[PDB]
Amino acid sequence: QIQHIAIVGSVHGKYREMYRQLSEYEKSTGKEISFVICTGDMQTLRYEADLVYLKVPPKYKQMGDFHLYYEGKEKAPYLTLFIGGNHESSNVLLHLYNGGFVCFNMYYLGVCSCININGLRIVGVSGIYKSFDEKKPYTYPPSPNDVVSLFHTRNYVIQMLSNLSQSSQIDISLSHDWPQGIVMKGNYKQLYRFQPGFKKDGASLGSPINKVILNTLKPKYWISGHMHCEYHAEEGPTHFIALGKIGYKNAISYLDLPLKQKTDLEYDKDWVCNLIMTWPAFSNKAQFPDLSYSISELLSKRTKELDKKIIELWEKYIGLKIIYDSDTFDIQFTSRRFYIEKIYNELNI
Ligand SMILES: [Mn+2]
Incomplete structure (x- = not known):
């Protein structure tokens, strides 16, 4: 008994093409897709006004396909889980920093989180690394002036995620940019001939944040997109898999994993505990996190x-099962924070 998991690189707003590719797998092979994992650049623009929050070069200022799904004209055939990359409707993702459905069958894991599905534990880290923004707080509501900084991965996610493998292992971990150094742990020579531009960064290619997280949690799999190439490497017990961008053949791969139990998408208990226990650091809705607090402490x-x-x-x-909620994202922001705050205050501490 195995489950077939689709893993996808950068979507760049090409949903219909991605799903068309996916259905051509369930028929070319007769295999059934349990669900779909996407490693970023989703570009979940709801409507024209969201184009403001999409940082892209001018030729890529496009709406893409997402809005069809948001309107209900199109329907995602598979449960699709994803993190944020460097090309996003960053206002939408900030509203859903604590995760959420952007539309039917499309679930964003937030800035970072751990979810449960089919007996698996899946960790997600959104964004890409820029040193100058790694300590920058998030400001809410989102402003167009933050289009350039919203998708940068903050350092604090390290502390948020570090204890997650204490009780059980991490099956799958996602990030957009590669963990730093892991380029050297595979056939980097074969890679460089195909991607001459990577040679210069050397071992420094990728995110130091993801490097730390991979080393700390040592998941069975680490999946990244972003680099427009296919790549495999091994860092100890962890299998690294990099994926290209939709529209090209290195964009989609598949994980055939043992299925122990079929189980709906659920919140991860340890993540929930971390989420509640760090509430004081996140209590200021205008600016978070407050790092006068120690996330570790x-x-x-x-x-x-x-x-x-x-x-x-x-x-x-809230419930352990993660279910679809069609409330506007600004409501979901306020709602999830309302219950986080309520739960913390009930512990009496
Ligand atoms: Mn990217």
Whole structure:
């Protein structure tokens, strides 16, 4: 009993083409896709006004396909999970920094999070690395002046994710840009001949944030897009897989994993606990996180009984199953934060 998981690189707003490719797999092979994982550059523009938040070179200022799905004209055939890249409707993703459905069957994992599906634990890290923004807080509501900085990966996600492999392993981890250094742990020679532009960065190619996270959690798989190429490498127990951009053949691959239990998309318990316990750092809706707080210290307060109560409270107000919610994203921002704050305050601490 195996589950077939589609892994996708950069979409660049080409959804109909991606799904058309995907259905041509379930027929060319007769295999069934359990679900789809996308590693970024989703460009989830709802309508024209969102073009403001899409940082792209001029020739790529396009609406793409997403809005058809947002309108209901098109329907995603597979449950599709994704993180943010460097080309996004960044206002939408900020509204959903704590994750959310952008439309039917399309779930954004947020700035970072861990989810559960079919007995798997999947960790996501959105964005790309620029050193000058790694300590920048998020400002809310989103402003057009932040189009250039919103998609940069913050350092704080390291602390948010670091304890996640304490109780069980991490099956799959996603990022947009590559973990730094991992280019050297594969056939980088074969790569360079095909991508001469990568040679210059050397071992420094990729994100140091993702490097730390990979080393700390050592997932079974690490999947990245962004680099417009196919690539494999091995860092200890972790299989690295890089994917190209939709419209080209290196863009989609498939993971045939053992399916132990079929199980709906669910919030990860440990992630939920971290999410609740770090609330004080995120209590200012205008500017977060507040790094006068230590994410680590806040998370050191996790105890078994506390975790147990959190999961009970989460299950009550929100539910363990991640379900589709068609409320406008600004409502979902406020709503999820309302319940996070409620749960924390009920712990009495
Ligand atoms: Mn990219």
